[PDB]
Every structure is written in C-alpha cells, then in structure tokens.
Design a protein around this ligand. Structure first.
Ligand code: HEM
Length: 293
C-alpha cells in the first residue's frame, strides 16, 4: 500500500520566512541574466520543479516532490534530467543562505518563483516537504518520452492523476525556454518570448505553419518558418480532437489559461503529500515588482 508523506512545517517558520526565500530566488533570477543566451534561469527552474514532482506514482505514492530526492545521483543523472543541473546549481547559494528549507520545498518553490517572476499567474504554494533518504529515490524512466502520440500523453498523465484539461494546461509551460539538442535530442524554442509566461504555446500550435522534419540528432520534430518547434507530444495536442478543443480555449482566453495552469501546477507540486487539517493555508507570494524591490 502507498507510503504516507505528512507535510511538516520547517520549525518555527511562517509566510515571512518563505517570502524571503522567494525574494532571494527572484533577485538571483534578475541578476544571472545571461544564462542560455540571455533566456535566464526561469525556464530551467520551472522544468526542475516539474521533473522533481513528475516522478510521482499515484498507485503507491513513490517519487513526487516530497522527498527532494533529485539531490541523489541516481535521480540527478537520469537521462531525462539532462541540463537540470543548471537549475540545481542556481539554487545552491539559495540553499546555503537558507539551510533550514527542505530540498523538496526549495525545488518546488524555485518553480513557483520562476513562473510568477516571468509574469505568470500566482501559484499558491505550501511548505512542509521533508527530505527522505537515498533509498527512497525513484528509478529513472518515470518522466515522459517526447516522440509519442496523444494516446501516450493521456495514459502517461493518468499516473500523475491529471485529466485532459490539466494535461493541456500544464503543457502551456512550453511557452518557456527551449529544447537543446545535446540535452534531449530536440532543438529549438516553442515561441518568441522564451522568458515571459503567456499563452503563446497554444497560439503557436494553432497559427504557425508546421512541417514535420528531422533535426541534427535524427529525431522528428515539427518546425515553423518563424524558427519555432513543437515536440511530437506537443503537436499531438492538436491531432487529438479532445485536446484540440482545450488548446483552442487557452489560445482564446489568457485569464482562463492562467487560472487553470495555477491549479494544475500547484496540484503537480503537491501530489503525494498529506497536509494536516491544521497545516497553514497555502502561501501566495508577492513578486519583486509588487514589493517595489
Ligand atoms: C508530454 C509531456 C512532456 C514532454 C514529453 C516534455 C519534454 C520536454 C523536452 C524534450 C524538453 C527539452 C529539454 C532540453 O533539451 O533542454 C522540455 C523542456 C522544458 N519543459 Fe517539457 N515536457 C513535457 C511536459 C512539461 C510540463 C508538464 C512542464 C511544466 C509544467 C514542462 C516544462 C518545461 C520547461 C519550462 C522546459 C524548458 C527548459 C529549458 O529551457 O531549460 N514540460 N520538455
């Protein structure tokens, strides 16, 4: 039967403590602006939060964000995690300054901070993930393949307890960053902005003229004359009629996408965690801009 992971608040800590950690992440995001040809660390931090959470298996409550297990070599050397060492290195000085925060809390908070600082929706966030030992590290192979179709995507996300709307909303994070050939065997950005969180992914899927091509790694990807790309799994969202309707909805309603993304992303980051009835309410952090910082 499933493991139980009970959220336990870092001793004596409250909203103000976590806002300080948020602020340190946000300030470093602003400072270290030349990483990845001036994209900055925002996208890789979102990907780190997702891959550290996305190992979860609803059937037995293995993997997931709780244990912060990416810090162990089996997980940080997962071929699916290639490049995420950059997000981990970014977070190192943060963890040094705030050694009291758990690894799971830091990885998930990095993702929340990145989305909000890149002008995305507010993502409520709860503390209390607790570091678990090396033998709790999930095996490689729990993160999704990119060369597959809509049926694969739908089935895959059932393991994370996500439905069609939640899947399409989550994939909207591909507005951010790019594929890097040496990391994943795919090359190129999904859009123009790269470090601003918008509904551009959906607009690009629908509005661009896509050609199925082979990249320099001999893998198929969909390319547009604008210099954008889509993975086979991204493109599957417009091949499947159920996914397509949701893509159209998000392409035509920025607010609805923001709201749905926020819920799904929080859910992703919280999967596998039992919050005590008297745990604090989720925190909604202010951006640097909102603070006048
Ligand atoms: C079918 C599901 C998914 C597949 C197959 C997939 C696959 C990929 C691949 C192959 C890359 C490129 C890695 C590289 O070469 O650097 C990537 C990047 C990225 N992924 Fe996804 N992904 C999926 C879902 C998601 C989700 C649910 C999120 C978050 C909500 C997400 C966030 C990101 C971000 C922000 C990047 C950019 C990373 C960077 O620029 O360094 N992805 N993904």
């Amino acid at each position: 039967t499933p493991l139980v992971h009970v959220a336990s608040v870092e001793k004596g800590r409250s909203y103000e403590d976590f806002q300080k950690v948020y602020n340190a992440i946000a300030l470093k995001l602003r400072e270290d602006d030349e990483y990845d040809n001036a994209i900055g660390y925002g996208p890789v931090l979102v990907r780190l939060a997702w891959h550290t959470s996305g190992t979860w298996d609803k059937h037995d409550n293995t993997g997931g964000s709780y244990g912060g297990t990416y810090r162990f070599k089996k997980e940080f050397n997962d071929p699916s995690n290639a490049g995420l060492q950059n997000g981990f290195k970014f977070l190192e000085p943060i963890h040094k300054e705030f050694p009291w925060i758990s690894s799971g809390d830091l990885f998930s908070l990095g993702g929340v901070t990145a989305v909000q600082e890149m002008q995305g929706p507010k993502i409520p966030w709860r503390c209390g993930r607790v570091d678990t030992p090396e033998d709790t590290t999930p095996d490689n192979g729990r993160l999704p393949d990119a060369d597959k179709d809509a049926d694969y995507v739908r089935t895959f996300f059932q393991r994370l307890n996500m439905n069609d709307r939640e899947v399409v909303a989550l994939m909207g994070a591909h507005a951010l960053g790019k594929t890097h050939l040496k990391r994943s065997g795919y090359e190129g950005p999904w859009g123009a902005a790269n470090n601003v969180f918008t509904n551009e992914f959906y607009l690009n899927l629908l509005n661009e003229n896509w050609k199925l091509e082979k990249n320099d790694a001999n893998n198929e990807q969909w390319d547009s004359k604008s210099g954008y790309m889509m993975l086979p799994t991204d493109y599957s969202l417009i091949q499947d009629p159920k996914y397509l309707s949701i893509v159209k909805e998000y392409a035509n309603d920025q607010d609805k996408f923001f709201k749905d993304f926020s819920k799904a992303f929080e859910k992703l980051l919280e999967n596998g965690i039992t919050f005590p009835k008297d745990a604090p309410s989720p925190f909604i952090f202010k951006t640097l801009e909102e603070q006048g910082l």
